[PDB]
Amino acid sequence: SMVYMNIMMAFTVSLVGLLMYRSHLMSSLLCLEGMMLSLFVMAALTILNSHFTLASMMPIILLVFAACEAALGLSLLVMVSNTYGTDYVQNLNLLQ
């Protein structure tokens, strides 16, 4: 019913100017690691309100990578700001 239009307007959290930008990359990477819960919850209802009884594990597997992988891509964000000290998306150097 209504709970399917919220949360959906929430899953436009993408909003992409705020997905790569502006600086403090950690804000961009943040709205990514919370782009989940729009994928999770939304898929923790349709599975639940009707009894699938089987795909019920799927919600668990939507995290176990969403944490595993998104925690990888954090790593690079040390390598960027190790050599700098400010992330600041404004580093372009490799060009085209």
Partner 1 sequence: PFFDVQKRLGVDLDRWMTIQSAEQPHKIPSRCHAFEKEWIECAHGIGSIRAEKECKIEFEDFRECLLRQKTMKRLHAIRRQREKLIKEGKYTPPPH
Partner 2 sequence: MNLMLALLTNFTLATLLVIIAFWLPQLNVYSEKTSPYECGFDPMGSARLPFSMKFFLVAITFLLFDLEIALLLPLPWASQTANLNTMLTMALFLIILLAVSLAYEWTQKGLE
Partner 3 sequence: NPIIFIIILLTIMLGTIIVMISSHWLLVWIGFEMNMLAIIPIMMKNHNPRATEASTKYFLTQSTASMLLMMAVIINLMFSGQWTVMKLFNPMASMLMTMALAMKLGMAPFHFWVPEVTQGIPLSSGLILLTWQKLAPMSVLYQIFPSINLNLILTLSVLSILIGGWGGLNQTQLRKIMAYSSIAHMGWMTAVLPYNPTMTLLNLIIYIIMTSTMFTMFMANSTTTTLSLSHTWNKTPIMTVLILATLLSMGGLPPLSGFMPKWMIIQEMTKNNSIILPTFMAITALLNLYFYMRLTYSTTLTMFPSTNNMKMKWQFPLMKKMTFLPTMVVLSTMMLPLTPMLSV
Residues that bind partner 1 (CB under 8 A): 1, 50-55, 58
Which residues touch 91 (CB under 8 Å, ≥6 apart)? Answer: 80, 84
Residue 53 engages partner 2 in binding (rule: CB under 8 A): no
Site string for partner 2, 58-87 (x = CB under 8 A): --x--xx--xx--x--xx--x--xx--x--
Closer Cβ to partner 1, 20 or 60, answer by number? 60
Half-sphere exposure of 92 (CA within 13 A, CB side): 3
Q: How far apart are CA 70 and CA 92, in angstroms?
A: 22
The binder of 41, among partner 3, partner 1, partner 2, none, by C-beta within 5 to 8 A per type, is none
